[PDB]
Design a protein around this ligand. Structure first.
Ligand SMILES: CC[C@H]1/C=C/C=C/C[C@@H](C)[C@H](O)[C@@](C)(O)C(=O)[C@@H](C)[C@H](O)[C@@H](C)C(=O)[C@@H](C)[C@H](O)[C@@H](C)/C=C/C(=O)O[C@@H]2[C@H](C)[C@H](C[C@H]1O)O[C@]1(CC[C@H](C)[C@H](C[C@@H](C)O)O1)[C@H]2C
Ligand SMILES: CC[C@H]1/C=C/C=C/C[C@@H](C)[C@H](O)[C@@](C)(O)C(=O)[C@@H](C)[C@H](O)[C@@H](C)C(=O)[C@@H](C)[C@H](O)[C@@H](C)/C=C/C(=O)O[C@@H]2[C@H](C)[C@H](C[C@H]1O)O[C@]1(CC[C@H](C)[C@H](C[C@@H](C)O)O1)[C@H]2C
Ligand SMILES: CC[C@H]1/C=C/C=C/C[C@@H](C)[C@H](O)[C@@](C)(O)C(=O)[C@@H](C)[C@H](O)[C@@H](C)C(=O)[C@@H](C)[C@H](O)[C@@H](C)/C=C/C(=O)O[C@@H]2[C@H](C)[C@H](C[C@H]1O)O[C@]1(CC[C@H](C)[C@H](C[C@@H](C)O)O1)[C@H]2C
Ligand SMILES: CC[C@H]1/C=C/C=C/C[C@@H](C)[C@H](O)[C@@](C)(O)C(=O)[C@@H](C)[C@H](O)[C@@H](C)C(=O)[C@@H](C)[C@H](O)[C@@H](C)/C=C/C(=O)O[C@@H]2[C@H](C)[C@H](C[C@H]1O)O[C@]1(CC[C@H](C)[C@H](C[C@@H](C)O)O1)[C@H]2C
Ligand SMILES: CC[C@H]1/C=C/C=C/C[C@@H](C)[C@H](O)[C@@](C)(O)C(=O)[C@@H](C)[C@H](O)[C@@H](C)C(=O)[C@@H](C)[C@H](O)[C@@H](C)/C=C/C(=O)O[C@@H]2[C@H](C)[C@H](C[C@H]1O)O[C@]1(CC[C@H](C)[C@H](C[C@@H](C)O)O1)[C@H]2C
Ligand SMILES: CC[C@H]1/C=C/C=C/C[C@@H](C)[C@H](O)[C@@](C)(O)C(=O)[C@@H](C)[C@H](O)[C@@H](C)C(=O)[C@@H](C)[C@H](O)[C@@H](C)/C=C/C(=O)O[C@@H]2[C@H](C)[C@H](C[C@H]1O)O[C@]1(CC[C@H](C)[C@H](C[C@@H](C)O)O1)[C@H]2C
Lengths: 75, 74, 75, 74, 74, 74, 74, 75, 74, 75
């Protein structure tokens, strides 16, 4: 039982690494939004909803990591 | 059996690392969509389906990681 | 319980790796803000709130990593 | 025997890491497709099959990782 | 106790890895400041405070890592 | 013998990590082909063979990884 | 006690990894300095101190890694 | 000698990680060749041999990794 | 004493990972030098000393990794 | 003695990871050379020696990794 609990806790820590991908990805989307609006201010209403979509889909990959993390810690 | 079970749990956590690739990739697709539409608004209906295709294929790679994670967990 | 405690502490350290994503991502958003405003000074009031939103969403991924780290350390 | 089975499961988890390369690469190809079509709409029919090829070849690297992963699991 | 102590030291070393994000991120912000000012010198006074804010927020992620490090050490 | 066998399986999983380089690299080559052709359609016939050569040389690095993998497995 | 000392030495080695962030970041700042001066020579006196600041702040992240490394070694 | 053999095999696997550098780098050189020739077709005969040199020097780093891998495996 | 000695050797190898940062960073500096000189030949004597400074600072980060490696080895 | 030899062999494998940096870096230099020559063919004789310098300094970082590798394997 000591070994299994220990393994759950190391596994939980490892499971958060993947979150770096969403941290970077979310930023890449918003950088594009900002550069896109600076170059063509009139496009704002068109690209803003695209940024929201991109951020959310990128963020979901981190959510999956965090889900495994919580399953290990509790489930 | 303790050691094997422990290995499954460590393995399950390792199996999520690869999801960082979909995290970045999905974003790269949407960044190109935003930049391409900003430079050429009239191209939006043409490239939007390309971004959806691109994002879905990038995501699938991460979903295959998660699948191995759940195989190990359960 | 030595093995489990040992695992909590190593797991806590591992759980901070993911914070490199927010460190890079936050910077990516601000670099876009700077470049966007340099190319088009008049867009500042428009893109500054987008940069704030972008920072916060990227930052959140780091918060989730640090949350797991502290759970392993203390909770 | 706990050791061998354990190693199979840890090994399978490690084997998914490389999938991050396909997650990013697939995205890089579709980003270029999107940027390329936005700058030159008339080029779409020429570059689209190139992007399909690029995706498939990048994706195959991920299939190889998954193959080793399943070999270890089963 | 020796095993737990060992773990604290290993964990403290692992906890510094994430500082590489701040190392790169601080530099990304300063690169943008430099390129921004070079292309448009008149914008210096506007973008400099933005660069201070950006690098401070990026560096704080590294400080959160170093904090866990020092929690494990002391 | 069990320990050596365990090591072969762990090593085989570790040996697939380097395939991410090919995943990204193949995609970098195709991105350049797409952007190159979009900017200058007339150059297609010249740059396409260069892209085949480039992706083949990039993918071979991944194949060298997979070879070590299969040496350890079989 | 072999365990604690061992952990100090492994931990110290791990603690240097983050230095890669300063190696890349320092380079990113100087690249921007170089590109910025090439595009606008008259801006040199304004951007050079900014690049010194950027280097120093990126470098400090590496100093923090090394600090933990020496704390573990001694 | 079980422990030493085990270590040779894990070490061999680890030694292939470095090959991702050549995989990315080789591609970076060829992408520049393609982009360079697209922008200036007449420069092809000049830059093609530079791309060949670049590929070979990047590739060599991968050769060194594979050399250690095979030394661990066989030598 | 066997375990401690073993830890030093594993540690020494881990301590070299961070050199990848100087490997990339040195290159980033020289890439900017080449591109800046190509676009503005007359700026060469001004930026060349900047590249030498940039490369040396980037390299130092890797040299600090190697230093920890040799401390552990000997 | 089993433990120390095993450690030397794992350490040797780990020591080659850093080579990926030179693999990528060498390529970054040559990509710049190629793009620089495509844009300004007349600059070739000036930038080629700079590429050689950059490649060599980048390559030396991989050499340092490989040195530790060989010290572990033999020394
Ligand atoms: C499906 C994937 C994501 C969904 C995105 C939906 C986007 C639509 C869009 C309109 C957003 O909701 C948006 C931009 O308005 C938004 O983020 C809202 C909710 C938010 O309040 C905005 C305005 C905001 O100011 C943020 C920065 C807020 O101040 C801070 C506290 C939240 C940060 C954050 O990352 O929240 C996440 C996120 C929304 C994520 C978002 C994801 O759920 O949700 C939260 C809350 C629910 C669970 C617990 C998730 C777990 C993560 C790991 O998936 O964390 C929560 C915890
Ligand atoms: C949703 C996620 C984030 C929320 C963002 C909200 C943004 C809106 C926006 C208007 C902010 O309020 C903003 C820009 O004004 C801001 O960040 C303020 C609060 C901040 O003081 C800024 C201006 C500032 O000066 C920074 C650089 C300050 O000097 C230093 C000490 C703080 C750095 C830092 O990272 O703080 C974090 C951050 C706000 C983050 C921000 C996150 O909470 O919060 C803190 C506090 C709670 C926990 C401990 C988190 C953990 C990190 C990893 O998320 O760190 C705290 C501790
Ligand atoms: C080199 C091998 C690859 C082949 C590519 C061939 C490309 C040609 C091109 C015309 C395609 O067929 C294309 C674009 O039409 C296509 O992918 C179709 C079939 C696909 O349905 C498209 C339209 C689609 O909508 C996708 C996004 C679909 O909605 C989702 C569910 C599938 C995602 C996905 O990654 O599937 C993969 C992929 C095709 C990949 C593609 C690879 O097989 O195959 C699948 C099935 C086989 C195994 C399990 C692989 C594992 C990956 C990691 O290699 O995933 C399968 C599972
Ligand atoms: C935030 C702290 C940093 C401070 C930066 C200050 C910058 C101001 C700026 C005017 C400098 O002084 C500058 C550019 O003149 C400078 O660095 C001088 C002192 C330096 O001699 C320059 C001209 C030089 O030629 C360098 C390349 C020199 O030849 C070589 C031997 C030094 C490389 C090096 O990295 O030194 C570091 C660095 C200054 C760093 C710089 C940091 O201390 O310090 C050293 C010494 C202290 C510790 C051991 C650190 C460890 C690193 C990883 O933080 O390395 C020392 C060891
Ligand atoms: C100095 C380092 C490299 C030398 C490069 C010399 C370049 C000069 C240039 C004119 C070449 O000869 C070039 C472009 O024509 C070339 O690569 C030829 C030989 C090659 O056949 C090309 C055109 C080719 O078609 C490739 C894609 C071929 O189809 C496939 C099967 C080979 C891929 C590959 O990576 O081979 C490597 C490579 C040449 C590498 C190349 C390296 O040796 O060699 C091989 C053979 C020796 C060992 C096993 C190395 C290990 C790798 C990791 O270095 O792989 C071999 C096995
Ligand atoms: C100081 C750091 C580096 C020195 C660079 C000097 C550059 C000057 C420049 C004129 C070169 O010599 C250059 C471009 O002409 C060159 O590489 C020559 C030697 C080479 O023959 C060129 C023309 C060539 O065609 C290459 C691609 C050749 O076909 C293949 C077999 C060599 C690849 C290679 O990476 O060689 C390395 C390299 C030169 C490296 C280069 C490094 O030593 O040297 C070799 C041989 C000596 C030792 C064993 C090193 C160990 C590495 C890890 O440092 O490997 C050797 C093994």
């Amino acid at each position: 039982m000591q070994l299994v609990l220990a393994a759950k806790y190391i596994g939980a820590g490892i499971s958060t690494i993947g979150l770096l991908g969403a941290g970077i990805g979310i930023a890449i989307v918003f950088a594009a939004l900002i550069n896109g609006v600076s170059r063509n201010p009139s496009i704002k209403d068109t690209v803003f909803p695209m940024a929201i979509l991109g951020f959310a889909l990128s963020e979901a990959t981190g959510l999956f990591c965090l889900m495994v993390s919580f399953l290990l810690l509790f489930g």
